[PDB]
Design a protein around this nucleic acid. Structure first.
Length: 161
RNA sequence: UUU
């Protein structure tokens, strides 16, 4: 079903925005959870994000998508989401798992990098840096992989065609 | 702002 997939895609993005890797990088969301201290950010906040906007504007639907989720739980009324497992120390191994890659224009987005790099391991985080002042792509990307073993399977593709 |  088309709904089946929309529901699967809300859950894959929210299981990301709260997922270890993204939480360690982006500060804004990390500011929201700490600046409440009870955990729990409103699903209101999530509807305001550009990647959520593309899927749904209804929050009750988001609550449905997160019933089955390893991370992120809801509490009494399907209005707020907390991590469900606490976030601690930022992993020092990060650098050994991340991979520098020089890309072809124009910015080629997350959808092209996930495609080519999924072939050698579960892609945890992608970073396409843009210059402050002018939102211009710096020509590169940073692809984090879970397992330093998957990381090498990509620097192997650095030598292959 | 994959806030």
């Amino acid at each position: 079903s088309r709904v089946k997939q929309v529901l699967a895609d809300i859950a894959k993005q929210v299981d990301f925005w709260f997922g270890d890797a993204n939480l360690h990088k982006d500060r804004f969301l990390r500011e929201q959870i700490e600046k409440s201290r009870d955990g729990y950010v409103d699903i209101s906040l999530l509807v305001s994000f550009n990647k959520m906007k593309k899927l749904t504007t209804d929050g009750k639907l988001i609550a449905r998508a997160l019933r089955s989720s390893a991370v992120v739980e809801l509490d009494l009324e399907g209005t707020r989401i907390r991590r469900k497992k606490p976030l601690g120390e930022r992993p020092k191994d990060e650098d050994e798992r991340t991979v520098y890659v020089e890309l072809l224009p124009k910015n080629v987005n997350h959808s092209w990098i996930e495609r080519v790099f999924g072939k050698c391991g579960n892609v945890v985080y992608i970073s396409i840096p843009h210059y402050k002042s002018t939102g211009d792509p710096k020509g590169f990307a940073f692809v984090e992989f879970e397992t330093k073993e998957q990381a090498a399977k990509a620097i192997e593709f650095l030598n292959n065609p």
